[PDB]
Chains A and B, each alone.
Chain A
Amino acid sequence: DIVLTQSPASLSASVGETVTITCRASGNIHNYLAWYQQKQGKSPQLLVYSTTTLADGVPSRFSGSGSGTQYSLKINSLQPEDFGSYYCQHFWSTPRTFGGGTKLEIK
């Protein structure tokens, strides 16, 4: 299977900071990569799909990039509601897999 290596595990940051989360794919997934946010006891929520496309209603401070096997989610000027966990998922053939996640907590 194509495994996704997500880093880092945790991130401590303050409101106003810009952070970066990465997912490295074990094989080329051809931009079929999505990112989700999950808040304390809520279901995951789609943020970005197809590497760079924001889901509707998702603020511009989130941006995705990457190609081939290295992928990134950038958050510009984190707001209080951005803290939670983040996950990447690949959609290249099957089986699909998720990254291990990143906990973004307040500094």
Chain B
Amino acid sequence: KVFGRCELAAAMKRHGLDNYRGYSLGNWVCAAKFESNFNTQATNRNTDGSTDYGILQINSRWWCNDGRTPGSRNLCNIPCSALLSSDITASVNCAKKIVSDGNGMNAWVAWRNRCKGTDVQAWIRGCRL
């Protein structure tokens, strides 16, 4: 399921990401654009048994359990496949777990390098909100 920016903004705001730990809603929408291009089914295997999953690309060695990654920590205590749904709830709940503080969006490399310092607000301007 590929999302629209506004549809995704709306849904993320519905789940408490607006100003979560100080981060404005646009950060989240920007992170998703660069991580999975708004695709819930997105997946990405890395040069280590790990695979990033879903709209926010959650790692299988640390946060979810894909069953095929050596040293899975499963911190969100979730199977990586639940993160692959069209309803973002589980992906959101794990991400809120990952961002334990005001500098935690750094957990996403695309955000830190492609979003931080830019007008992320631009992604939600004109959206019903």
Direct contact of A and B (CB under 8 A): yes
Selected from A32, A53, A91, A92, the residue in CB contact (under 8 A) with B22 is A53
Q: Which residue of A lies closest to B129 (CB)?
A: A30
A96 to chain B, nearest CB (A): 11
CA distance A92 to B122 in the complex (A): 10
By DSSP majority rule, is chain B's interface helix, strand, loop, or mixed?
A: loop
Find chain B residues with CB under 8 A from A32 CB. Answer: 24, 121
Counting contact residues on chain A (CB < 8 A from B), the size range is under 10
Whether A50 and B19, one on each chain, are in contact in the complex, defined by CB atoms closer than 8 angstroms, is yes
Whether A93 touches B24, Cβ cut-off 8 Å, given contacts A30-B129, A50-B19, is no
Whether A50 and B24, one on each chain, are in contact in the complex, defined by CB atoms closer than 8 angstroms, is yes
Find chain A residues with CB under 8 A from B22 CB. Answer: 50, 53
Find chain B residues with CB under 8 A from A92 CB. Answer: 121
Residues on B close to A: CB < 8 A?
19, 22, 24, 121, 125, 129
